Write an enzyme that holds these catalytic residues in place. Structure first.
Site, short mmCIF file in Angstrom:
data_model
loop_
_atom_site.label_atom_id
_atom_site.label_comp_id
_atom_site.label_asym_id
_atom_site.label_seq_id
_atom_site.Cartn_x
_atom_site.Cartn_y
_atom_site.Cartn_z
CD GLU A 126 75.99 51.50 51.99
OE1 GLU A 126 75.04 51.85 52.72
OE2 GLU A 126 76.84 52.30 51.54
CG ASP A 127 69.77 49.61 54.39
OD1 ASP A 127 70.64 49.38 55.25
OD2 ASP A 127 68.89 50.48 54.52
CB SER A 128 71.61 44.23 50.16
OG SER A 128 71.41 43.11 49.33
CG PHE A 169 72.59 48.15 47.39
CD1 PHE A 169 72.66 48.47 46.06
CD2 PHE A 169 73.76 48.07 48.11
CE1 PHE A 169 73.87 48.69 45.46
CE2 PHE A 169 74.96 48.29 47.51
CZ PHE A 169 75.02 48.60 46.18
#
Ligand SMILES: [Zn+2]
Ligand SMILES: [Zn+2]
Ligand SMILES: [Zn+2]
Ligand SMILES: [Zn+2]
Lengths: 49, 44, 289, 132, 55, 55, 50, 64, 48, 99
Positions: D2-4, J49
Site C-alpha cells: 500500500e504505497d510503501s 501509506f
RNA sequence: ACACCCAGCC
C-alpha cells in the site's frame, strides 16, 4: 463557538504521526513510537495488589 | 567575544555595548567565531 | 507559593503547562493560562498618551446605508482628543522629515520618545510643534552618535536655524539632560560620501581633522568648518578634486568660512597628513587661496 | 504494501538520501517603548523574572549561542530581556523535538537600524521509517 | 574503533558478495516463463541449444 | 572552514577503509575495554591537518 | 428593547499579552468603549439641552 | 555535492575514482570505456560515478 | 536474503531516479498530555 | 504511568466517514517514529501509506477504557451493519500471494 | 492573536 468549540474541541492525550505498514502485528494492534508512549500517560489507581 | 567581519575575515574584540561595525573596513555584518568547546561527531 | 516551601520560586513547565515547586516537585496552583496567541484589536501606539479605544465605520454597502440624497447616514466622527490628534500630526510630520534624509527607523523612534517626553512635560506650549519636532530629531541624531548639522535638519523642515536652535536649547533645559560634544569626525562619513571621494581619502580626512583639533591648531572654529577644510585640503592631495562650491553646498559652510579655515590649516601641511597615504599630488603643490 | 518502500539500511549508512535541515531563527532588539528596552544579554535567575525549565547555560556573554554548540528541545539560543517598567525574559526557544548544531550566528543592523541576530541551526536528517 | 557490518555499513569489509547456486535450473527453484530468453550463468554447463538443465 | 559542514566531513571520514590485516584480531572492542574513553589497546588515533594557501 | 446593555466579563473579552509590553484588547472591549463614549455624549447633550 | 566515498549499493570504493574518470574523459575516452578502465563492472558503481555532479567545484567559487 | 533460496519469480530490478520529499516524519510526530491551554476557551492550543 | 504494551487506544483517520473509522487498538511499543497498522485495517480506515497521518486518542479512566474495549475494538467491527459484509479483508500482497 | 498565502491526506 457551538460548532468550533462545543460540538468538537481540541483534546488532551492525543498523538498524531505518519502510518507505515507492519504485517507482523495483529489486526487489533497498533505500533506506537517510544516517544509518543513516553509522553502521554495513563492514571492507574494504587491498590494493595 | 570575538566576531568576524563578513567582508574581510578579521577578528574583532567587541563588548556588548559597542554598535556593530568592523574596525578595518566598516562592513555591518559580523559572524560569531566557532566555539572552543569540543563537539563530538560519530561518523556513523 | 508552595505550602511546604513558601520561599522557593515556582518553575513554569510550559510543555506540561504547570507551576511546579522545584524542591518537592509539588504542582501548586492550577493549569497555566498561557497569555499569547492561539478578534484582537490593533497594536495601540505606546507613544500615545490616551487609550484611544475607538473604531471606524466602513463604507456603505446598500440602500439602507445611504440617505435620501447621495450621502451615508453614518460618518467617521472620531473621538480623538485635541492632544492625541496634535501629537499624531507631529509623529507623522517627524516620519516625513526623517525619510527626507534617509534616517533609520531607530532614530525616528528615539525622536518620538523625546517628543512625547517634551509634550507630557509641558514646558514649551508656545513653540510650534514642528519646531519641537525638528529639535527632537536633532537631539535624537546627536544621541545616537550620528549627528546632523543644524543646517541639515533645517533643510528638511519649514523651521529656521534660529527657531530650531532655540527649541533645542530649551528642550535640553527642560529634560535636564546633556549630549556629547560633536567632533570633526562624526560629520565626515556623510560630508565625504555625498561628495563621492575614495576610502583612502576618508581615512586621510578623518586622521587629519582629528590631529588638527587635537593639537589646537584652530581656535574656536565650529567642527563643521574644520571638517570641511579637512575635506578640501585632503581632496587636492588625491586625484579626485573638489571645488569650493561643491564642498560648501554639501557641508553648509560659506566660501569665506572655508577659505579662512584653509588659510589657517595650510602652513602645517606635511606634518598633519597620515604617514601611509599615496601623495598623488605633492604637498607643496596645494594651491593657496 | 500500500504505497510503501523498503530501504537498504546499508545504503542509508553509506549516505543514501541523507540530507541536512537548516532552520534560521531571527531576533530583533527594540527600543520603541518610552521606557521598556529589549537587550541581548545572558539572563540570570537572580535578576530576571519570566524564565522556564530550560537551561540558560549554553549562551555567551552577549546573549547569543556560539556556533558549533549542540542544541536540543527546550534550549535557549537568544538571551533577550525587556526592561520591566526588574526585567522580563522573552527569549527564542528551539522548537519541540528538534535537535541540531548551531551553524552560523550573524549579528548586524536591520532596515530599522536595530540590532538584528540570525542563528542558523543545522540538523542532519538520515532517512527513517516514515520519510516520504 | 573495531566493529562489524551489523552496526554500520562503514564496517562492511566486502564490496559485493556475488553468491550463486545451481546455475542451471536442475532444481527449478526459479521457474522461467520463457527459458530461452534468459542469459546463461557464467558457471553454466550447457551447450547453446539447451536453455536449462532437465528437472 | 571548508564548504562542507562538520557532520559531512565526519561521515566521509567514517567510510574510508583502513588496513586491518592482522591488528583487528589483537584489538578489543571499545565497549569491552577497561579504559575510560579510548586507548591504544582498543582504538587507533588519526590526525588530519590541512590548510590551503596556494592559488 | 435594549434599555440597559449587559457588559460581558473579562473572560468573554480577554486582553492578550504579546511580546514586550502590550495591552491588546478584544473587539468587544473596543465596542464597549464606543458604546460608553456615545452614551456619555448623548447624556451630556441631553443634560445641557442640545 | 562531492563524489561519495563508497557506492551506495554494494560498498565498492569510488571516492578515489572521480579525478581519474575526469582525466580519462579529457583524454577523449567515451564514458563506457572510461568506466571499464576504472574497474567498475557492476552497474551500481557505474551509476554512482556516471550520474554524479561535481557541485563542490561551483561551491568553491565563493570566497570563504 | 534471509535464506539464500532463489526467489521463484524473477524480479524487475534496475536504476530509477528517486527523490526525497520534505515531508519527513520527525517534522510531523506529535503528542500531548495536559499541555498549555488557550485564553478564551481554556482548551488545548492549536498546532504541534 | 507511561502507556505500555496492551493499553487500549482509539485510533482515528480523517475524514471520519463511517463508524469503523474510529476503532480501538492495543498499543505495542516499537522502535522508530511511526504508527504501525496491520494491512487488513487499511480498508476501513481508507488509509494508504503514502504519507497518511492518523490520530491516537488514549482513554483516561477505567470506564472509558472498558467500553472502548467492549464496543469498538477492531475484532468487534469486522462486520459492518451498513451492508452486512466484512468491512475488512485480505488485500494487496497477501491476496495476490494467496491466489 | 488576526489575516493571507503555500502545502499534506482524502
Ligand atoms: Zn571588515
Ligand atoms: Zn514545595
Ligand atoms: Zn581501551
Ligand atoms: Zn557498486
Amino acid at each position: 463557538r457551538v460548532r468550533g468549540n462545543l460540538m468538537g474541541k481540541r483534546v488532551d492525550f492525543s498523538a498524531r504521526t505518519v502510518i507505515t505498514p507492519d504485517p507482523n502485528l495483529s489486526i487489533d494492534q497498533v505500533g506506537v513510537p517510544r516517544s509518543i508512549a513516553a509522553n502521554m500517560t495513563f492514571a492507574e489507581i494504587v491498590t494493595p495488589f | 567575544m570575538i566576531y568576524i567581519c563578513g567582508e574581510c575575515h578579521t577578528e574583532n574584540e567587541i563588548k556588548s555595548r559597542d554598535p556593530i561595525r568592523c574596525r578595518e573596513c566598516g562592513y555591518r555584518i559580523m559572524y560569531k567565531k566557532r566555539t572552543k568547546r569540543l563537539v563530538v561527531f560519530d561518523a556513523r | 507559593t508552595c505550602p511546604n516551601h513558601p520561599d522557593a520560586i515556582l518553575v513554569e513547565d510550559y510543555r506540561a503547562g504547570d507551576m511546579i515547586c522545584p524542591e518537592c516537585g509539588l504542582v501548586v496552583g492550577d493549569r497555566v493560562i498561557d497569555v499569547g496567541s492561539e478578534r484582537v484589536g490593533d497594536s495601540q501606539n505606546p507613544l500615545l498618551s490616551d487609550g484611544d479605544l475607538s473604531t471606524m465605520i466602513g463604507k456603505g454597502t446598500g440602500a439602507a446605508s445611504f440617505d435620501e440624497f447621495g450621502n451615508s447616514k453614518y460618518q467617521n466622527r472620531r473621538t480623538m482628543s485635541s492632544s492625541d490628534r496634535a501629537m499624531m500630526n507631529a509623529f507623522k510630520e517627524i516620519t516625513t522629515m526623517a525619510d527626507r534624509i534617509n534616517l533609520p527607523r531607530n532614530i525616528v523612534d528615539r525622536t518620538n520618545n523625546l517628543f512625547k517626553q517634551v509634550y507630557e512635560q509641558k514646558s514649551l506650549k508656545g513653540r510650534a510643534n514642528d519646531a519641537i519636532a525638528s529639535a527632537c530629531l536633532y537631539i535624537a541624531c546627536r544621541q545616537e552618535g550620528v549627528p546632523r548639522t543644524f543646517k541639515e535638519i533645517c533643510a528638511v523642515s519649514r523651521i529656521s536655524k534660529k527657531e530650531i536652535g532655540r527649541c533645542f536649547k530649551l528642550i535640553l533645559k527642560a529634560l535636564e539632560t546633556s549630549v556629547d560634544l560633536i567632533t570633526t569626525g562624526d560629520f565626515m562619513s556623510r560630508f565625504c560620501s555625498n561628495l563621492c571621494l575614495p576610502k583612502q581619502v576618508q581615512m586621510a580626512a578623518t586622521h587629519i581633522a582629528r590631529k588638527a583639533v587635537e593639537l589646537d591648531l584652530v581656535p574656536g572654529r565650529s567642527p563643521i568648518s574644520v571638517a570641511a577644510a579637512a575635506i578640501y585640503m585632503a581632496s587636492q592631495a588625491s586625484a579626485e578634486k573638489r571645488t569650493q562650491k561643491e564642498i560648501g553646498d554639501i557641508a553648509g559652510v560659506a566660501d569665506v568660512t572655508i577659505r579662512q579655515s584653509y588659510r589657517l590649516i595650510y602652513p602645517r601641511a606635511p606634518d598633519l597628513f597620515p604617514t601611509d597615504f599615496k601623495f598623488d599630488t605633492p604637498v607643496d603643490k596645494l594651491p593657496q587661496l | 504494501q500500500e504505497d510503501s518502500v523498503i530501504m537498504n539500511r546499508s545504503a542509508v549508512d553509506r549516505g543514501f538520501f541523507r540530507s541536512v535541515f537548516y532552520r534560521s531563527y531571527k531576533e530583533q532588539e527594540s527600543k520603541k517603548g518610552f521606557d521598556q528596552e529589549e537587550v541581548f544579554e545572558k539572563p540570570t535567575r537572580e535578576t530576571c523574572q519570566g524564565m522556564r525549565h530550560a537551561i540558560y547555560d549554553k549562551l555567551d556573554d552577549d546573549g547569543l549561542i556560539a556556533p558549533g554548540v549542540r542544541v536540543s528541545g527546550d534550549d535557549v539560543i537568544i538571551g533577550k530581556t525587556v526592561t520591566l517598567p526588574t526585567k522580563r525574559d522573552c527569549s527564542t526557544f528551539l522548537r519541540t523535538s528538534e535537535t541540531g548544531i548551531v551553524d552560523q550566528v550573524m549579528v548586524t543592523l536591520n532596515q530599522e537600524g536595530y540590532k538584528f541576530c540570525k542563528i542558523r541551526v543545522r540538523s542532519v536528517r538520515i532517512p527513517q521509517i516514515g520519510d516520504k | 574503533k573495531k566493529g562489524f557490518g551489523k552496526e554500520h555499513a562503514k564496517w562492511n569489509p566486502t564490496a559485493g558478495v556475488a553468491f550463486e547456486y545451481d546455475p542451471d535450473n536442475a532444481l527449478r527453484h526459479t521457474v522461467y516463463p520463457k527459458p530461452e530468453e534468459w542469459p546463461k550463468s557464467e558457471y553454466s554447463e550447457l551447450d547453446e541449444d539447451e536453455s536449462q538443465a532437465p528437472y | 572552514s571548508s564548504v562542507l559542514h562538520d557532520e559531512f566531513i565526519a561521515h566521509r571520514l567514517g567510510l574510508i577503509p583502513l588496513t586491518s590485516d592482522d591488528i583487528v584480531d589483537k584489538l578489543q572492542y571499545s565497549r569491552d575495554c577497561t579504559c575510560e574513553e579510548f586507548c591504544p589497546e582498543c582504538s587507533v588515533e588519526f590526525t588530519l591537518d590541512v590548510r590551503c594557501n596556494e592559488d | 428593547i435594549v434599555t440597559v446593555l449587559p457588559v460581558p466579563p473579562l473572560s468573554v473579552r480577554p486582553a492578550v499579552v504579546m511580546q514586550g509590553s502590550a495591552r491588546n484588547q478584544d473587539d468587544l472591549t473596543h465596542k464597549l468603549a464606543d458604546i460608553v463614549k456615545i452614551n456619555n455624549q448623548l447624556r451630556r447633550n441631553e443634560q445641557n439641552g442640545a | 555535492m562531492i563524489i561519495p566515498v563508497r557506492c551506495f549499493t554494494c560498498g565498492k570504493i569510488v571516492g578515489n575514482k572521480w579525478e581519474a574518470y575526469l582525466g580519462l574523459l579529457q583524454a577523449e575516452y567515451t564514458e563506457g570505456d572510461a568506466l571499464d578502465a576504472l574497474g567498475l563492472k557492476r552497474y551500481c558503481c557505474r551509476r554512482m560515478l556516471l550520474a554524479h555532479v561535481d557541485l563542490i567545484e561551483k561551491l568553491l567559487n565563493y570566497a570563504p | 536474503g534471509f535464506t539464500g533460496r532463489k526467489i521463484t519469480s524473477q524480479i524487475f530490478i534496475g536504476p530509477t531516479y528517486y527523490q526525497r520529499l520534505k515531508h519527513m516524519v520527525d517534522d510531523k510526530i506529535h503528542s500531548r498530555a495536559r499541555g498549555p491551554i488557550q485564553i478564551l476557551n481554556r482548551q488545548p492550543m492549536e498546532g504541534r | 504511568r507511561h502507556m505500555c504494551d496492551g493499553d487500549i487506544v482509539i485510533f482515528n483517520r480523517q475524514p471520519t466517514l463511517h463508524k469503523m473509522s474510529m476503532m480501538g487498538h492495543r498499543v505495542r511499543i516499537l522502535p522508530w517514529s511511526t504508527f504501525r497498522l496491520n494491512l487488513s485495517v487499511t480498508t476501513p480506515y481508507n488509509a494508504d501509506f503514502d504519507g497518511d497521518e492518523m490520530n491516537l486518542h488514549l482513554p483516561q479512566s477505567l470506564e472509558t477504557r472498558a467500553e472502548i474495549q467492549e464496543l469498538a475494538m477492531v475484532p468487534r467491527m469486522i462486520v459492518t451493519p451498513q451492508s452486512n459484509r466484512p468491512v475488512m479483508g485480505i488485500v494487496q500482497d497477501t491476496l495476490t500471494a494467496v491466489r
